[PDB]
From TrEMBL:
Parent-protein residues present: 8 to 296 of 520
Sequence ranges assigned to domain ESX-1 secretion-associated protein EspB PE in this UniProt record: 4-77
Organism annotation: Mycolicibacterium smegmatis (strain ATCC 700084 / mc(2)155) (Mycobacterium smegmatis)
GO molecular function: identical protein binding
Residue span of region Disordered: 1-28
Recorded coiled-coil stretches: none
Domain annotation ESX-1 secretion-associated protein EspB PPE: ranges: 111-258
Protein name (Swiss-Prot/TrEMBL): Antigen MTB48
Record lineage: Bacteria, Bacillati, Actinomycetota, Actinomycetes, Mycobacteriales
Basic and acidic residues compositional bias, start-end: 4-16
Length: 272
């Protein structure tokens, strides 16, 4: 039994804390739909990548357990019952890298009463997306804490295999950190959005603006017309702000590093 090595291995398979959940768009405007699918696409892409990383962390655990099996083979070839060649860790039964689903990425007038309706037929506070944003943001730190599971090499283990695992462990550890920064990246892109949406709600004519105009007894058509003109301008001006002020970026996280073949292991690799 090689408990230092099993510990490292077990550490490596560690359950990754849950990613952020589903969000829903706050309304039915074209802008909203376009920006929303892009954030959903970005998030989709990250989950698929973290799953791939889950594989690598697990491949490493297998690597270490394979070396461990190799070490026990060495002690077995200490048959003092029959009275010291290096052994290659069996990796012929270790899962390969989990493929990252090649899913593609989206990319992009009406009267004010209608616009108003659509807007206020939705969540004017965009809580699902604010929540989505909140979650992704927090996951940054979490994913950083997660990578700490790999940062430190098995204790009392030296040799080429042990340094091979170490370097691979460090690369995964750094990568989970970088994946954490991608969370912060998504969240800032979400924030760009919910803030812009918030400005639209704040500046587009409200449902009160609608009734106030529909229930007004207008002296003439000139008064009624000129009063409409101003709310159609106000509608269009806020909606173009929303369109420009909400355009956002595609999150493209890099594939996790993989560990590959281990060398042979020797007696005296592991502490007594």
């Amino acid at each position: 039994e090689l408990p230092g090595l099993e510990r490292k291995a077990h550490e490596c398979e560690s359950t990754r804390p849950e990613g952020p959940g589903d969000a829903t768009k706050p309304d039915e405007l074209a802008t909203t739909a376009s920006v929303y699918s892009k954030l959903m696409a970005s998030a989709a892409k990250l989950k698929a990548t973290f799953a791939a990383g889950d594989r690598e962390g697990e491949r490493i655990a297998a690597a270490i357990r394979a070396a461990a099996g190799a070490y026990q083979k060495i002690e077995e070839q200490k048959a003092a019952e029959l009275s010291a060649e290096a052994v290659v860790p069996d990796m012929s039964g270790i899962p390969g890298p989990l493929a990252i689903p090649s899913m593609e990425y989206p990319s992009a007038e009406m009267d004010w009463e209608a616009a108003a309706r659509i807007i206020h037929s939705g969540d004017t506070q965009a809580l699902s997306m604010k929540y989505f944003r909140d979650q992704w943001r927090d996951y940054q730190s979490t994913l950083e804490g997660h990578g700490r599971h790999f940062a430190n090499p098995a204790e009392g283990w030296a040799g080429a295999a042990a340094e091979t695992c170490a370097e691979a462990q460090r690369r995964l550890s750094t990568w989970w950190a970088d994946m954490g920064a991608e969370c912060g990246r998504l969240a800032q892109e979400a924030t760009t959005f919910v803030d812009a949406h918030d400005k639209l709600v704040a500046n587009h004519p409200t449902l009160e603006n609608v009734r106030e105009f529909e229930e007004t007894e207008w002296a003439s058509e000139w008064d009624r017309q000129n009063a409409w003109a101003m709310l159609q301008e106000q509608s269009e001006d806020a909606l173009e702000a929303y369109a420009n002020g909400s355009q956002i970026q595609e999150i493209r996280p890099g594939k996790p590093p993989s560990i590959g073949g281990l060398p042979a292991v020797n007696d005296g690799d592991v502490q007594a």
